[PDB]
Amino acid sequence: PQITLWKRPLVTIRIGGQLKEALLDTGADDTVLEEMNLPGKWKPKMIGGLGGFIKVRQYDQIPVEICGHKVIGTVLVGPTPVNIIGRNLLTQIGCTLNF
Amino acid sequence: PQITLWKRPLVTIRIGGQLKEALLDTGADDTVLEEMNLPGKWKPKMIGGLGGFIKVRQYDQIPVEICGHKVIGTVLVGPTPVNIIGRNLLTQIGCTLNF
Numbered sequence: 001p002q003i004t005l006w007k008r009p010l011v012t013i014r015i016g017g018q019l020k021e022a023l024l025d026t027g028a029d030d031t032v033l034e035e036m037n038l039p040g041k042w043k044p045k046m047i048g049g050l051g052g053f054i055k056v057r058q059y060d061q062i063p064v065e066i067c068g069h070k071v072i073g074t075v076l077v078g079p080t081p082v083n084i085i086g087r088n089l090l091t092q093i094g095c096t097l098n099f
Numbered sequence: 100p101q102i103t104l105w106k107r108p109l110v111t112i113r114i115g116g117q118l119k120e121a122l123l124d125t126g127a128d129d130t131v132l133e134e135m136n137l138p139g140k141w142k143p144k145m146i147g148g149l150g151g152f153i154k155v156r157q158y159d160q161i162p163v164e165i166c167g168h169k170v171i172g173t174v175l176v177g178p179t180p181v182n183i184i185g186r187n188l189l190t191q192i193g194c195t196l197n198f
């Protein structure tokens with residue numbers, strides 16, 4: 001796909017058999033999803049964004065399907081205003097910015 | 100150009116006599132820059148990210164040069180930890196996401 005930016009780059013992702021909408025977010029280093037349950041061990045962590053720091057649960061080596069492209073990587077779960085796919089996963093689907 | 104996402108997509112922007120480093124950020128609706136004293140009328144605004152909201156000043160029709168490309172639009176100004184080029188300006192340079 002080529003995705004233009006007149007609207008939010010929202011795509012459907014598959015994670016744990018769940019379908020969610022997420023924002024392709026080149027300004028995010030990391031992928032952060034709203035509160036959900038994922039299996040396996042996790043580490044408590046903190047990350048900062050525009051309005052300060054939040055607490056997240058860090059899940060590693062999680063399979064996600066983004067627009068039919070399969071990635072396996074780190075997913076942070078916590079109180080994000082929207083599901084954001086960060087660069088850790090955008091790189092795995094071969095995503096670039098072009099102009 | 101094509102910009103990969105292995106690293107933060109930082110680029111040089113010019114606005115007035117000031118050069119700045121800013122993020123090409125598909126996750127940001129509007130452009131937001133750190134402390135600067137722009138001319139003309141502005142409106143107060145609140146924008147939300149991870150961690151909550153910050154107050155900014157909305158300046159409209161501001162000329163900006165991004166990677167040699169002259170552009171013109173809204174620039175928000177406030178205590179962002181990083182300068183962000185938002186979709187409002189990315190569209191004007193014909194920026195797309197591709198994978």
Ligand SMILES: CC(C)CN(C[C@@H](O)[C@H](Cc1ccccc1)NC(=O)O[C@H]1CO[C@H]2OCC[C@H]21)S(=O)(=O)c1ccc(N)cc1
Binds near residue numbers: 025124
């Ligand atoms: C939270 C997003 C939905 C929207 N934002 C842009 C977003 O790309 C920020 C942009 C950003 C970038 C750096 C610092 C603060 C904000 N990234 C971000 O929060 O990423 C976090 C997840 O990975 C980590 O890597 C960077 C911060 C962490 S935002 O900064 O809050 C924001 C919101 C509204 C506007 N107009 C402009 C920016």
